[PDB]
């Protein structure tokens, strides 16, 4: 329950936003100047077992997974195993997707860029697949519908982009996506407790996912597709992210270029609140010197803020989907 601060009002800021958002529990990580300044749990990870959220509590990070997927690709691109410009059909078997009359080549970069032209959500209706391709090979599903624009024309935030990058990782690496990230990244990084979601029912160290019915939290077990694991299903803790945050802030020399490329912008956005553009699993504000991404699922909500300049990071993981998570980093940000 790490803290390096003599006395402070940080707790009251955290505790106020959580209580006002009806967030049962969250663990908060603040890393500034290359060492964690505070790692602490607030509220309950499980209301019924009455267990206190802690740095060891694991939450489904959601959309925060995207950063990993994207970095994995960049790493592959660097090793020479794939090329950011080569089309996806070179790594996916018959990935043909069209606009209007005819099919349109989609580059890898365009997937990272979220400019691929793939539609975002709700095509499949109520949380399941008619033919149970629960597993990664979702290519058949994406293929069903036409692109909104030619690849590279306009930005659309879709899980499918990073989902397809997930395959690319699996097909190229010749091992399951999960297996690769763990072996290549999570283990080397020392993120020994980080894993991917299947089952959907939490064990002792996993945090229970809550979803507000009326004004009170109720346990939520949302039906999920495994193909979404690259984009939104990583389950980590603030204790593991600790390594991930320090890596993104001051990467070891061999990784600085790769990491920097990770933050470099690929397309612009006009819908995220504090962001003008998106790069490789991260929203960007270059003018403010900020790199962040918000993750939201039905029963979880999380946020990761990085300022490569000024060497500080803010991580908020909470067990409920609430606006207040983004709000909390803002209040925690102005504090530095």
Swiss-Prot record:
Predominant subcellular localization, coarse grouping: membrane
Species assigned in the record: Staphylococcus aureus (strain N315)
Miscellaneous comment text of the record: Has two of three conserved motifs typically found in penicillin-binding proteins (PBPs) and beta-lactamases, but no penicillin-binding activity has been detected.
Membrane topology label: Multi-pass membrane protein
Name recorded for this polypeptide: Protein flp
Locations listed in the record: Cell membrane
Gene: flp
Reported function: Its precise function is unknown. Has no penicillin-binding activity and is not involved in methicillin resistance.
Record's GO cellular component terms: plasma membrane
Keyword annotations of the record: Cell membrane, Membrane, Transmembrane, Transmembrane helix
């Amino acid at each position: 329950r790490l803290t390096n601060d003599s006395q402070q009002q940080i707790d009251k800021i955290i505790e106020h936003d959580l209580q006002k958002g009806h967030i049962p529990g969250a663990s908060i990580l603040i890393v500034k100047n290359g060492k964690v300044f505070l790692n602490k749990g607030y509220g309950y990870q499980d209301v019924d077992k009455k267990v206190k959220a802690s740095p060891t509590t694991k939450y489904e990070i959601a959309s925060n997974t995207k950063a990993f997927t994207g970095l994995a690709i960049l790493k592959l691109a660097q090793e020479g195993r794939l090329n950011l410009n080569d089309d996806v059909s070179k790594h996916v078997p018959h990935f043909k997707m069209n606009y209007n009359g005819q099919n349109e080549t989609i580059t890898i970069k365009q997937l990272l860029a979220q400019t691929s032209g793939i539609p975002s959500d709700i095509t499949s209706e109520d949380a399941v697949t008619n033919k149970n391709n629960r597993l990664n090979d979702v290519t058949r599903a994406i293929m069903g519908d036409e692109l909104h624009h030619k690849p590279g024309e306009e930005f659309e935030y879709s899980n499918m982009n990073y989902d397809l990058l997930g395959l690319i990782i699996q097909n190229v690496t010749k091992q399951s996506y999960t297996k690769y990230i763990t072996n290549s990244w999570l283990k080397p990084l020392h993120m020994t407790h980080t894993s991917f979601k299947q089952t959907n029912n939490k064990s002792k160290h996993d945090a229970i996912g809550y979803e507000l019915q009326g004004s009170t939290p109720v346990v939520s077990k949302p039906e999920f597709n495994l193909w979404d694991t690259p984009s939104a299903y990583m389950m980590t803790s603030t204790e593991d992210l600790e390594h991930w945050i320090k890596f993104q802030l001051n990467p070891p020399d061999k990784y600085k270029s790769l990491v920097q490329q990770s933050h470099k912008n690929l397309s612009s956005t006009i819908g995220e609140p504090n962001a003008n553009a998106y790069a490789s699993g991260w929203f960007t504000n270059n003018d403010e010197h900020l790199v962040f991404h918000s993750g939201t699922l039905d029963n979880f909500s999380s946020f990761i803020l990085l300022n490569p300049k000024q060497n500080y990071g803010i991580v908020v993981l909470a067990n409920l989907n609430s606006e207040y998570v983004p709000k909390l980093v803002e209040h925690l940000n102005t504090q530095i």
